[model samples]
Target chain A: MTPHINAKIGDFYPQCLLCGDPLRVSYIAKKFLQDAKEITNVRNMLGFSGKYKGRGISLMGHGMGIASCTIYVTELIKTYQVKELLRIGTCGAISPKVGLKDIIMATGASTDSKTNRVRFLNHDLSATPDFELSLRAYQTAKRLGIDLKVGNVFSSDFFYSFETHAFDLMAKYNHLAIEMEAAGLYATAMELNAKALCLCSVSDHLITKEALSPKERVESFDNMIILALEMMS
Target chain B: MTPHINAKIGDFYPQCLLCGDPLRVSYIAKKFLQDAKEITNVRNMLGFSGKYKGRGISLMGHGMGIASCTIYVTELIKTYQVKELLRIGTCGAISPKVGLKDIIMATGASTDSKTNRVRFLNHDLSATPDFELSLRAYQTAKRLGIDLKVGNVFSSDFFYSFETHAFDLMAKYNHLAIEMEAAGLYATAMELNAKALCLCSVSDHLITKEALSPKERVESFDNMIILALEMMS
Candidate 1:
C-alpha cells in the first residue's frame, strides 16, 4: 500500500516505537519484546510487531534526515494506522543543561530543515509532540527513576554541521541538543492528527566536547529504549 | 579546483550568468557572446567565458535543486574569484500579478528547503539579493523596456508539490511564483559575501492553468537573458 513500507494493513500495532537505526530496532525487538515478529523489511529498513510487558507494541526504523524520516512516519500513520509514535534516538548535546547519558524528552522541535514550513503555511511551524504522550513520558520516566531532561531540540539537515558557532544561540533559545528527525516526526504527526513524542539520549556534548565510550553508548541507549517502551505500555 | 567545477583559476571572469540548464548556458554563450570559450564541463555542467557588448563575462549551468545550485555557486565564488552572480531561470506563476513571459526580479526568496536555516542560526534567514545588483537589474530592465515584476518567491524542495492547495496562501504573502532555487542562491551569496541576484520568467501560470508553448518559452527566456546580461554590464 506504501512505497517505503511494504507491510500489509494492520501489520503494525496502533502504537509504534521509532529509531533511526534498523539494527537498533532489531536489538529492541530481540532484547525486550516477547513473541516479536519481523513485520516489514523494505529497503533494509526493518519493522517489528511484538508485546512489551504483555502489551502489544510495534518497532520500526526510520532512516536518518528529515526527508527519510518523514517518508516512513507518514506511511506508518497514514497507511498502517499507527496512532501513537514514540521516537527514540541519540543527539549531540548543545546545551549546558544536558550531558552524556542524560535522556531528553523533546517537548518541541525547532528545525533548520524546511519540511515543517512546507507542511505548515510558509510560516514557522512550532513542531510539538502530543500532550498526552509527553505527559506519559514524564510520568513513566519519573516512575523509572530516570532524570528526563525536558526541552526543545533543534533538528538539523546536516549531521556534520557548519553552524557550530551558533550552538550557544540555539541553546539560549532552549534547544537542548541537536538531532536530525524529531522535527520531522513531530510535524508529520501534527499533520496527520496522530500522537507523537521524541525521546533522545545525549551521546556527545558538542560544546563541552565530551563523548561516551562504546559501552556507555549502548548503556545510555538502552535506558532511553526502556523508557520509551515503558511509556508506551 | 573544486570537485564539481574543474575550471582552472582565472578561467572565469569576475561576473557570471547562471542557468539551471547546461544547454541554455551553451545557447547564451553561442548566441550572445563574442569569442565565447568553454572553460568547464565537469559532470556535463558547462561553463563559458567570453566578451558580451565588449565586457568580459562568464556563464555556467547549475543543475536543479538547492544542493546542486549551492555547490556550483560556492565554487564559482570561492575558487574562481567571481565577484557577482546573476541567476536567470523559469518559475511557475502562483500570483495573479504575473502571467506567461512576465519577468520577475526576486527581491527575496522564501524556501521550504532547510539549507538557509543550516546556514543561518536556525532562524528564518530572510534570503534577499544584493541591493546594488537589484538596482542595476531595475535600471537595465527599464532601459530595455521590459515590465519587471519585483517580489518574493517561495523556493520549494519538491518540484511536484503536495501543497498546491496552499498556493493562494503563498500568493497572499507576495510570493509571485514557485521556483526550485533562489533561496539557496541568495543565502550562498550572503554567506560568501559575494553579490548575487535572481531573475526569473514565468513560463506557466500554475493558478490559471496556462502554459507557454515551446517557441514562446524560448522567446521569453531570451528577454530575461538579455536583461540579466545587460545588468552585468
Candidate 2:
C-alpha cells in the first residue's frame, strides 16, 4: 500500500530482520521463527510474520543495492510502522586484520550513494547504526565466543567495478568491510526514528584476495545470525 | 606517464572536454582538432589530445556515473596535471516545458552522491560550475544562435530502481534534468584545484516521456561541444 510494497496495516511486526537475498530470507525464516507465515512475495523479496521466543518478529528480503533497500525500509517504516530493523548480510573484508569469515558489526557506513544528500539537504548524515543495537550485538557476539570486529564499512554502488585500489584506500581509512546496502538502510531508519543495525560476515577479502568457499560462508554466517536474533530478543 | 594515461609532463594541454560516451570522444576529435592523436584508451575511456583553432585542447570520455567519472577527473588533475575540465553529456529533462532535443548548461548539480561528503568532510560543497567557463558557454550558445537553458541538474546513482518518486520529488525541487556524472566531476575538480563545467543536452523529457532518437542525440550534442571547444580559444 506504500506504492512499492503490498503489505497491509498489521502484516508486519514492530521488530524485523532485513536481508538482501530472498533465499537467505527464507533460510532465516526457517531457522529462527517459531510460527512463520508468508505475508508477501512481491518482486521476489519475501516477507514473513512470526514469533521468535514469544516476541513478535518479521523477516523481509530487501533485494540488492541501497536504492532497492531504501524503498523497502521506507515502506516498512511508513506503512508498517516497524520500530527496529536489523540487517544481516555478507561482505568483502577490506581490512587485512579482519580475515574471511570474521563477523563485522558496522558502526558506521561511508558510502558514495546520494540518498542522504536528498534527505538531509546537502548535510552529510553519517549513516550510522544504532549504538544500542551495535552494543547489544557486540556483547552477544562476545558471549557466544565469536570472533567479532567493529568499524566503518564502505557501502559501495558498484559491487564489482569499484577501483582496484579502493579497498586498500578504504582499509587505510579504517574500513573493515565493503557491502552494498547498509548506509541507505541506516539513513532511512534514522529518518523514520527507528533503530537499525547491520551485522555482516566477511565472505571474501578484497585485500588478501581470499574468499570463503560455500561451506565456509554458510557455516560462519550462523554465529552472526544467532547474534542478530539474540540481540532482537 | 601515469599508470593509466601515458602522457608526459608537458605533453597535455591545460583545457579539456569531457563526455560520457566514447564514440562522442571520436566525434569531437574529428570536428574540432586539426591534428588529434588518440592518447589513452584504458577501460574504454578514450582520450585524445589535439589543438582547436590553434589553442590546445583534449577530449576524454568519463563514462556513465560519478564514481567512474571522478577517477578520470581526479587523475586528469592530479596525475596528468590538467588545469581545467568541461563535461559535455546528454541528460533527461524533468520539467514539462523543457522539450526533447534542447540543451541544458548546468549552472550547478544537485546530487545524491557522497563525493561532496568525501571531499568536504561532511560540509556541503555546492557543486556549481566554474563561473567563467559557464559564462563563456552561455555566451557561445547565444553567439551561435542555439537555443539553450541553464539551471540545476540532478546526479543520480541508479539507472534502474524503484526511485522514480525520488526523481519526481527532485523535479519538484527545481531540478531541470538528471545526469549521472556531473556532481562528482565538479567536486573532484574543485578539490584538486582545477576548473570544471558540465554542459548537457536534454536528451529526453521525464514528464512528457519524450526522448530524442539516437540520431537526434548526436546532432543535439554538437552545439555544446562547440561551446566547450570555444572556451579554450
Candidate 3:
C-alpha cells in the first residue's frame, strides 16, 4: 500500500495479482480469495489479501495507464516488500498473428512512455519481465492449452492520439499487442529488485477492428486467470 | 498543414503561435489576427498565418503530448522556415506555492519523454527555451500585469498518469508546473536551430486541487496569448 492505495506494509501478501481495472481486482478477489479481507479501497484502487489453495495472494487494482500502474506497483515492491508481482489485463492486437481472444505473455515491452528512459538516463532499457515468472507462466499456459504468445507490446503516453505512423513503426518492430501498463510495471519491478510478470488477453484488434464484447472480455480471460492461478499455486 | 498540419510551406509566416489546441488557434486567428486565413485543418490542428499587432503570426495547433508536439514543431521548423516559435498554452501547477491562473514562462523543460533521449543517444539534454525569446516573453508578461513565473516543467509521458511520488519529487526539485509539450517542443527547436519560447497560463493547482473553470481558462489563456504576441513582434 502507498499514497494512492491505502494499505500497511504488512497488509499485502508475498504474491500479488496486479490488475489494471478495479472491477477486475474485485472480481479476482471474490472469485479466488478464501476468507479474503478487503484491505484497501483508497483512490478507488481496491486491494485484498487472502488464501488461495493454502497460498497467500494479494489482489490490487492498478488503474488505467502506466503512470497510474507504476505508482501502485512501485509501492507494492518497495514499501510492501512484495516478492512477486503479476499484471494481468486486456490489450489490443498490434500484430497480425495475435487474433482476438489470444493471450500475450510479454517478453519485453516498447513504449512511448518515457518512464524507463528517464530513469535510465535516456538509455532505452528494455522493460523485460522477470525471466523465472515469465518462463513459469509460459509453462503453465502450455499445460493449460492457453494460446500464449510472447513479444514486445507498445505502451503509449496518449491513449487517444493520432500518430498513424507510430503504429506502423511498432508493427515493423514485431510488437504483438498494444497495451498501456506492461512496460512501466516491468521497469518499476526491475528497478525495485522484485520479480514481475505480465499477461494480457487480446480484447481487440487494432488493424482488424474486431472487438470482444464486455461479457466476452470478462469470460475470455478465464484461460489467463487459470494460468495465473496455476503459477501462483 | 501537411498530413497533421495541412499547410504548405508558402502558407506559413515566419513567426508562429504554437499552441496545443486547434480551437485556440482558431480563436486567436478569429479574434486577434488581422486578415486571418485558415491554412490548415488536418487532424484538427488548425493553422493560420495572420497579422497581429502589425506583424504576421501563424497560429498553429500542436495537439497534446510530446510526440504530437514534436511532429508539428519539427515540420514547422523545417518545412515552413519559421524563425520564431512561441508556444502559448495552459498548465497545472505541481509546486505548492503556485496558484491557478498564473503564468509560467518555461525557461527549460524536464520531461519523461524519449524524444530528446532518442535524439541525444541516451544522454539527458537540457530542453531549454531560446534565451532571448524566453526573456522577452517574461518581460512582456510582467509589463502586461500577468502574474508569470519561470522555471522547469515536468512533461509527463502520459497525460493521465498515477505517479504521485514522481510529482512530489518534482515539486521538491522546484518544477514550476506540469504540462505535456514544452520539453519536446524546446528540444526540437534546439535540434532544428530555431528560436522558441513557451508561455503557459496556470489553470490548476495539483497541491490544493484548485482548477480553473472553462471561462477562467480562456481568460487566463487570453493573457498568455497577449504576452506571446508582444514577444513575437
Candidate 4:
C-alpha cells in the first residue's frame, strides 16, 4: 500500500478516470459504471474499480495541483500498473474564441512547473497526451456532436495570485485554457509508457469574467466525463 | 514610484544588495552602510539607499520566490534605473562536494519556471549571470579567503513536494545548490541590460542531512553579503 492509496494488487482497473476531487470520483463511478466498488480511500482520495460498457475501469481522484497529482498517477502506474489513464477536470478558458462549457482535449500541456526540468535535465520535454487517446477523444467528441476545442493549456502553480496577468503571456503562446495538472500527468505517463489524456470542460472564462455556478459546473462536467468513458470503452 | 515600492526616480543607487527577507535588508544596510535611508516599503519589502565603504549602494528584500522577486527586480531596473543587482541569499546544498557555509556564486541557473520560456520562446535561454559580475564575486571571494563554489543551480518552484528525488537527477547533471530566485533574476537582468549575480550561503545540506541553525545562518550569511558588497563596490 502506498502512502496515499490503500489499494492492493489488482484492486485498480486498467482503464482509469482521474479527477481532482474525491467526491467527483464517486460521482463519475456512480454515473457511468455498470458495476463499481470502492477499492481504496487512502488520504480521502477515493479510488474505485468498476466496469463501463463491459470494459474494466477505475475512477480515482488525484487531489489538486501537478505535484500532488503526479504522486498519485505515478503510484497508479508504477504500483498498480494501470495502463490507460484519462484526466477529466475543469479549466478556465484563456482564449477569447473558446467560451465557457466548451470541451477541450489537451493535445499538449505547456507549464511553468519544474517537473519536466528535473526529468529531462537540459532538454525541454513537450508534455503531450498519448496521440491515440487524443485522436480517440477528438473522434468521440465528434461522435457525440459536442463542439470540442483541442490545444495547449497552461498548468499554473498559483491558483490565486495578484500576478494573474502573467498568464496573459502564456495566452500569447497559444494556450487555450489554464488548468493545474495536465503537464505533470503527461510527463509522468510518458516516462512510464502509460497512455494518458486530459479532457477539460471550461467552467469559467478568465478573459470575459464569465463563470458557471457550482451546479452548472457539475452539469457541464458530465458530458466531458461521458465522452472520456466512451473513448475508453 | 510604483505600486510596490515608493521610491523616487533617483532614490536607488547604482549597486544593490538583495535578500529574500525584509529584515535582512535592514540588517545588511545597518552593518555595511555609513549613511542609510529607507527608500520604500511596499508589501513589507523594505528598500534602503546607503553608502558602503565610500561607495553608494542599496539594500532591498526580494521576497520569497522567483515570481515575487522578478517583479521587484524588474521594477528596480525599469523604474528605479538601478544598473547592477546582486542577490545574496541562503540556499541548501544539493551536492555532497559542497558543505555548510560554502558560498556559491552561481554562473547560471537552470529552472522549471516558464519565465525564461516566455522570454526566449522555443530557445533555451541559459539564465547566465553577467560574466563581469561573476568574475568580480569570484575574485572577491579569493581575496577574502572564502571557499566559493561556482556552478549551476536549480531554481525550483515547490519548497517541499513528492518530487524531492527529482534533485538526484539534477545532481547527476552537476547543479551545485537549489534556490528560489536566481533564474528569474538573471533572466530579467539580461533583458533590462543590467548586470546581476547570485551569491548564496549554504544553510542546509540535502546530501548530508545537516542544516545550520538560524544563528549560524546569519553569521555565515553576513560574510557572503559583505563579499557581495565588496564586489559591487
Give the TM-score of each candidate.
0.57, 0.56, 0.58, 0.55
Task: Assess candidate 2 and give its TM-score to the true structure.
Answer: 0.56
Q: Write the per-residue lDDT of candidate 4 for residues B1-233, one digit (tens) a residue.
A: 77467888899988888887667788878877878999987545689998887889998887655655777887899899888999988787888768998999888899867667766765799998999888888888899998889888988754544368777887778788898789978988988899999988899987778988868988898888789888877
Q: Which residue runs of candidate 3 sit more than 4 Å off their true CA positions?
A: B1-110, B114-233
> What's the candidate order when arranged by decreasing lDDT?
1, 4, 3, 2
Which residue pairs does candidate 1 place in steric collision?
A: none
lDDT value, residue B38 of candidate 1: 94
How far in Å is the alpha carbon of B138 misplaced in model 3? 18
Cα error, residue A67 of model 2, in Å, equals: 10
What digit string (tens of lDDT, one per residue) describes model 3 on residues A1-233? 34465787699988998876666777777887798888886544578998888888898887556666776777787788889998888887878878888998888888877677667877979889899998899888888888688888887654444454567678778788887778888888887889999888999888888998878887888667777878998
The residue-by-residue lDDT of candidate 4 on A123-207, one tens digit each, is 7899999998888888888999999887899876544433477668767777889887899789889989999999889988888
> How does residue A108 of candidate 2 score in lDDT?
92
RMSD from true fold, candidate 1: 10.3
Worst 10 residues of 3 chain A by lDDT: A156-165
For candidate 1, report its TM-score. 0.57
The regions of model 1 sitting more than 4 angstroms off are: B1-112, B116-161, B164-233
Q: Is candidate 3 or candidate 4 better by DockQ?
A: 3
Best by lDDT: 1
Query: Judged by TM-score relative to the true structure, which candidate is superior, 2 or 3?
Result: 3
lDDT of 1 by residue, B58-176 (tens): 99987655655777888898899999999999998999999899999999999878787667677889999999999999999999999999999998865557889999999999999
Instruction: Give candidate 2's whole-model lDDT.
Output: 0.78
